[PDB]
Amino acid sequence: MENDKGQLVELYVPRKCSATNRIIKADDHASVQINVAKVDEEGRAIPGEYVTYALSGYVRSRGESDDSLNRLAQNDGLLKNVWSYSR
Amino acid sequence: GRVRTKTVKRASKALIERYYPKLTLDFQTNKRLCDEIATIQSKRLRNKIAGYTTHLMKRIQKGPVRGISFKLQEEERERKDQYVPEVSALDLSRLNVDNQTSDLVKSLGLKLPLSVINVSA
Amino acid sequence: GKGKPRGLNSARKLRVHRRNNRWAENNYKKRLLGTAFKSSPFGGSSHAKGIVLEKLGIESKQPNSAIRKCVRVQLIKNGKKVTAFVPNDGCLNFVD
Amino acid sequence: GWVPVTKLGRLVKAGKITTIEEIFLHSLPVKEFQIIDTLLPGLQDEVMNIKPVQKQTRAGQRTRFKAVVVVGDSNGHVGLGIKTAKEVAGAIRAGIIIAKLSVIPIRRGYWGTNLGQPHSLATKTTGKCGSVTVRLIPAPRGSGIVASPAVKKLLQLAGVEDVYTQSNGKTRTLENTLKAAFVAIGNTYGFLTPNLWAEQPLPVSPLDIYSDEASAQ
Amino acid sequence: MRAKWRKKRTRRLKRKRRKVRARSK
Amino acid sequence: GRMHSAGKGISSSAIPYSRNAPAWFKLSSESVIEQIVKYARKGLTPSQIGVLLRDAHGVTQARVITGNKIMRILKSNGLAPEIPEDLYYLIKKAVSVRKHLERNRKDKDAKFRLILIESRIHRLARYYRTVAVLPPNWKYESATASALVN
Amino acid sequence: SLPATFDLTPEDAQLLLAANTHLGARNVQVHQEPYVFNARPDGVHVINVGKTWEKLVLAARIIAAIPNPEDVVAISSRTFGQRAVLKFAAHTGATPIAGRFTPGSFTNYITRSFKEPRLVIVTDPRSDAQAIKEASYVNIPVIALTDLDSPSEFVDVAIPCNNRGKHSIGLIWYLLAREVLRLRGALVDRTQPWSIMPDLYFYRDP
Amino acid sequence: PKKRASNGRNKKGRGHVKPVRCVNCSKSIPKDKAIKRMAIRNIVEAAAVRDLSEASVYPEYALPKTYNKLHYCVSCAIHARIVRVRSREDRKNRAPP
Amino acid sequence: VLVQDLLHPTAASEARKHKLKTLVQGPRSYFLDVKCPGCLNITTVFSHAQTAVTCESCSTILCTPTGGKAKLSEGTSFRRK
Amino acid sequence: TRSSVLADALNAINNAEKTGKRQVLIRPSSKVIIKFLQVMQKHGYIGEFEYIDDHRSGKIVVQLNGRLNKCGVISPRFNVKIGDIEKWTANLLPARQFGYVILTTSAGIMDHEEARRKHVSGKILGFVY
RNA sequence: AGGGGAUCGAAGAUGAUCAGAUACCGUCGUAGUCUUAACCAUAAACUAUGCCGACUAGGGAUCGGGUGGUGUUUUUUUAAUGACCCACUCGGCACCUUACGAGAAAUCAAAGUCUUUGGGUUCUGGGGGGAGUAUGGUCGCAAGGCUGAAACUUAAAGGAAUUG
């Protein structure tokens, strides 16, 4: 996206879906970003520490985003065992 | 047929949600306060507003009805909305599920007080 | 798929499909049958001289309504009578 | 003045959002044209066509006017708005509004070498509504906007310098031609290229962090 | 007309033309 | 599939991945080939030889037990027939239909089946002529086929 | 990471057994298939409450992530969960739409019932299907208390729970209200339960 | 255009079923395309059962019921109130009520 | 759900799916060691036995072919192999 | 019948990425499509793929990382010259910056950027971008 | 060409209706409807969707077959045994919902995997008429079928939906 002499020229870098690696469109009104909080001792979380996922409108239209959030939970440690890789 | 039109439905919505503390269930006195809470041009229309107003206030006193929200029900709802206990339900008072919930503890490195009882096959 | 021979040795079928379906245009058919040379009063020409035979009052097709003062002219280069139009306002005082 | 009604309007009027690039980053849904007005002060408008469509009634034909409006700065933003209103002034003044609400960015990229500022599109892109399939083709520099007299005005306000258009279908339908090129403008970001392959930290939305003052009650 | 009875007048015309042609030939 | 039919069936047999002999087998490659020979002296089709192997004995396949197939063994031992069993039964099927036709002339469906069987024979005979299993310039003469297939 | 205080103790498992949350619908859709243990001879499919609770942890961890509780939306349409939604609103901000959804509440800014959500939670996508499609225009995450036969289009966090026993939908709102309250604050440690029964959440006749 | 997905009939994988005749005008129609009504009714009329049981020599009667399978063409079924011209979204319904 | 492990599938799904559409294609059939009271020899009989079997020593019936796997006799013991 | 197993390979690959699937099953696993996918693997359009070796030519399972937006074939394998390579790249590929058209060549199966660099030509197998 | 020939029934006879009615309606009624031996080779012969192949989305029935159940039912109440139920599976006629997709739309799970345009292959079409006409060839006992124009004429014909 940059030109010959560095100095990156763009409008904005587009976001990508966490489930299918598809670029979030500007008009993608069905595409949503989910923030989930980070927890600490004695069942209390802290504000400002959030794990950010982006889900495309295509994946939500297919009805498959629930297990997509399950898979994005398993690959970093949001949920321990909710999505089976083998099925 | 003596059904009531949209103008006397809508204005009887408006002055009930705005003047319910100033409102009284008796028809002969809510008719006279309709003059001082609104500028109704004609006396017969004012009778139509006040008759539906005392009809709806008769319906409000037998439990609240949706579509009407005056000032008093807002703070009554806020009195319901400030319901907090000192402590709530799920606690460490005693996972009572199958071996998958043991894999919740075992696979990614946790230490949870399991009481594993499998489901019937 | 898509209804045509795609394979690498199928240039014969592509030739014969194109050369047989090219007989459904108007310009290719007029070029190959030579209809301008055979069935046309102009024998491959843009102009042809002729002689006035009669003046014919032709009523136009509706919604127009006009007598257009047409002229019937025998053409010289083959001998076919044609019906001809005279431009602008009349000119039947200018041709006899 | 103008009072906001949406939380995006509250953030724009308060100055928390400095540019529309954050809006297009998080795909924030615009509901007020004063958001685009006060955050793009240099936005120019153009009326492409006024098509009078009519409805057969018992009285005869009652006729409304359909206005297609192209807006956009040449810095890479363009919008299309179609409104059917009873009068030509109202159709223009409301077609401008929907064109403000439908402002989308365009991906200006490079044909060959990545020289200086971008001139053309970074990829070829398909847009199709109806039969009208407009194919935008990247062009070298100095090629010009090789387009229809309506699509060229759409691409001039989109800010691209040289581009080729291959428009098929019944492209005499002007509103379908402009909408198909509008779709082909929008899918330029949606096409994925290997220079964007790096994973990003996925920045938080301004609506999530500015919750302490927006829509204050 | 249908495409049936345009065809029927065609076929009766063709039958009449065939009989006339065989009469001349 | 289904060369002369509208069916889409996939009913077939998928032998296991093990190309070596199973552990439950007890006979050897020099002990089942005599059973191949004596069953062929009993005048049976190799399609029926493999059935009798798989059923009466534990002999699963000739390839998985021995180093050669059933018809490969018969050609090596000298009990190869004049024509292959695929062409034999197709001609036998055709003769059965042809015997049916002179007693049922108006059996037009069975008449149509004859062209289906005749086309299956002649494609298969064209294949055997290309790989020189049948002799060249061999014709299904359509009259004296019963000399070949009894 | 997860602290050790998130045990599914048998006291709340007894609550799930009393609420009949584990047994559900007669058929399972393909996006709810991993949430089913096995089948039963009488034909009633079962839902494992451990994965139900872990999805409820995730849903609570998204609700408590937003700093404002007033732009979180709870949706009910049928009478089977009106009181549970309102009692969920009775402890957090959590603005409710109980009854008619009146479409044009997430778009159509001139509506009096127009709202400005950052997250929606529905009782079920089958009965609240208009809220799901309207949230697909504003980029709103959807937390859905899905059944097995419930379609799961445009939803993101599916908690599999029963919607036939009366106490099941009330308890799945009650545990979710419990967990968002713990994760926000103003609650003491997890060594003792609520003073009264969860009967305050369930719908009663009349 | 195609008014119905199954064009007016119940015929997939046949090509030809049988012809049947209408019970009103005797029109040769296919059997699946025919509008079929199992006209099940008692022989006697309900305002005459009282007098028939009054005149009955039997203490208990079977009170019988005659049957017919009325096959209708589409012209006759619409004219004789058997079927109605429904809405475009209502054509897809197949329940008898 | 667009993510499956198509290299180690569950054996319940392997028993569910077709014998050809299995990831490693193979038979669902087996062989049986069948013992008759009228003979002392042991005979390996296919599950889909496909042909009536006589014993090597005596004339007896121990299977009856059908469309699928053959029906073993009532007064005959069998063991899987 | 299966007249081109490479075409039936890349069609199911295209159907997987249009669905957005992380994995797909491909039949019946020729070495042409193994070397085709090795060209895709060394450029990063797909993940590490597993070849299940049966005795019936087997099948493979391909991991897709979503970077591949269209993987088409050119059927049949047209005979291409050196000057015709840059004629075909302007038509098959969306931009001159990226995208590969894959040749079969006596030096091996490789993309057009490597074939232009080593100055040899062949028959077009397909294209990726 | 022969046998057969009950009903229905082209033609025809009439009797009504109607301004007319040699059409609808009524009663007859020939060929025909049936068969066998030959012809014809046409149908809105239509799923108006070539055939083969792969993949993509879910569901529930149903046909035929096959697998499994400490499932039910049948003289003996798990002992001599088919049907039914449930879970599947292959092949078929299909159907319902949603369309990511496609299309001009109706609609389509194929009409999808088509401007991000290439799985293989056959046939057909190039505005409407003239016209499936004339001529020629071939097949047929014939009726006719297959192939098949042009002159000339016209700025529309047509498809799907919307309102009146």
Swiss-Prot record, chain C:
This protein's name: Small ribosomal subunit protein uS12A
UniProt organism field: Saccharomyces cerevisiae (strain ATCC 204508 / S288c)
A Gene Ontology BP annotation from the UniProt entry: maturation of SSU-rRNA from tricistronic rRNA transcript (SSU-rRNA, 5.8S rRNA, LSU-rRNA)
Consequence of substituting N64A: Lethal mutation
Major site of localization recorded for this protein: cytoplasm
Positions spanned in the full protein: 2 to 97 of 145
Gene that this sequence comes from: RPS23A
Miscellaneous field: Present with 10600 molecules/cell in log phase SD medium. There are 2 genes for uS12 in yeast.
Function description: Component of the ribosome, a large ribonucleoprotein complex responsible for the synthesis of proteins in the cell. The small ribosomal subunit (SSU) binds messenger RNAs (mRNAs) and translates the encoded message by selecting cognate aminoacyl-transfer RNA (tRNA) molecules. The large subunit (LSU) contains the ribosomal catalytic site termed the peptidyl transferase center (PTC), which catalyzes the formation of peptide bonds, thereby polymerizing the amino acids delivered by tRNAs into a polypeptide chain.
The record's account of how the chain is modified after translation: Hydroxylation at Pro-63 affects translation termination efficiency. The stereochemistry of the 3,4-dihydroxyproline has not yet been determined.
GO annotation, cellular component aspect: cytosol; cytosolic small ribosomal subunit; ribosome
Swiss-Prot record, chain E:
Positions of region (Disordered): 1-25
One function term, GO molecular function aspect: structural constituent of ribosome
Subcellular location: Cytoplasm
Keyword terms: Cytoplasm, Ribonucleoprotein, Ribosomal protein
Predominant location: cytoplasm
InterPro entries assigned to the protein according to its UniProt record, in alphabetical order: Ribosomal_eS32
Purpose of the protein: Component of the ribosome, a large ribonucleoprotein complex responsible for the synthesis of proteins in the cell. The small ribosomal subunit (SSU) binds messenger RNAs (mRNAs) and translates the encoded message by selecting cognate aminoacyl-transfer RNA (tRNA) molecules. The large subunit (LSU) contains the ribosomal catalytic site termed the peptidyl transferase center (PTC), which catalyzes the formation of peptide bonds, thereby polymerizing the amino acids delivered by tRNAs into a polypeptide chain.
Something else known: Present with 11900 molecules/cell in log phase SD medium.
Annotated protein name in UniProt: Small ribosomal subunit protein eS32A
Gene name, Swiss-Prot/TrEMBL: RPL41A
Swiss-Prot record, chain F:
One biological process term in Gene Ontology: maturation of SSU-rRNA from tricistronic rRNA transcript (SSU-rRNA, 5.8S rRNA, LSU-rRNA)
Disulfide bonds: none
Cross-link for Glycyl lysine isopeptide (Lys-Gly) (interchain with G-Cter in ubiquitin), residue positions: K38, K42
Record's subcellular location: Cytoplasm
Keywords: Cytoplasm, Isopeptide bond, Phosphoprotein, Ribonucleoprotein, Ribosomal protein, Ubl conjugation
Sites bearing Phosphoserine, chain numbering: S31
Superkingdom field: Eukaryota
One GO cellular component term: cytoplasm
One Gene Ontology MF term: structural constituent of ribosome
Membership in a protein family: Belongs to the universal ribosomal protein uS15 family.
Subunit structure: Component of the small ribosomal subunit (SSU). Mature yeast ribosomes consist of a small (40S) and a large (60S) subunit. The 40S small subunit contains 1 molecule of ribosomal RNA (18S rRNA) and 33 different proteins (encoded by 57 genes). The large 60S subunit contains 3 rRNA molecules (25S, 5.8S and 5S rRNA) and 46 different proteins (encoded by 81 genes).
NCBIfam families, A to Z: PRK08561.1 (NF006331)
Function: Component of the ribosome, a large ribonucleoprotein complex responsible for the synthesis of proteins in the cell. The small ribosomal subunit (SSU) binds messenger RNAs (mRNAs) and translates the encoded message by selecting cognate aminoacyl-transfer RNA (tRNA) molecules. The large subunit (LSU) contains the ribosomal catalytic site termed the peptidyl transferase center (PTC), which catalyzes the formation of peptide bonds, thereby polymerizing the amino acids delivered by tRNAs into a polypeptide chain.
Protein name (Swiss-Prot/TrEMBL): Small ribosomal subunit protein uS15
UniProtKB/Swiss-Prot annotation, chain I:
Cellular localization per UniProt: Cytoplasm
InterPro entries: Ribosomal_eS27, Ribosomal_eS27_Zn-bd_dom_sf, Ribosomal_zn-bd
Cofactor note: Binds 1 zinc ion per subunit.
Residues that bear S-methylcysteine: C39
SUPFAM superfamilies (alphabetical): Zn-binding ribosomal proteins
The protein's required cofactors: Zn(2+)
A GO CC annotation given for this chain: cytosolic small ribosomal subunit
Zinc finger (C4-type): 36-58
Keyword field: Cytoplasm, Metal-binding, Methylation, Ribonucleoprotein, Ribosomal protein, Zinc, Zinc-finger
One GO BP: ribosomal small subunit assembly
Modification note: The N-terminus is not modified.
Molecular function as annotated in GO: RNA binding; structural constituent of ribosome; zinc ion binding
Described function: Component of the ribosome, a large ribonucleoprotein complex responsible for the synthesis of proteins in the cell. The small ribosomal subunit (SSU) binds messenger RNAs (mRNAs) and translates the encoded message by selecting cognate aminoacyl-transfer RNA (tRNA) molecules. The large subunit (LSU) contains the ribosomal catalytic site termed the peptidyl transferase center (PTC), which catalyzes the formation of peptide bonds, thereby polymerizing the amino acids delivered by tRNAs into a polypeptide chain.
Miscellaneous comment: Present with 43300 molecules/cell in log phase SD medium. There are 2 genes for eS27 in yeast.
HAMAP family assigned: Ribosomal_eS27
Family label: Belongs to the eukaryotic ribosomal protein eS27 family.
Name of the protein in question: Small ribosomal subunit protein eS27A
The encoding gene: RPS27A
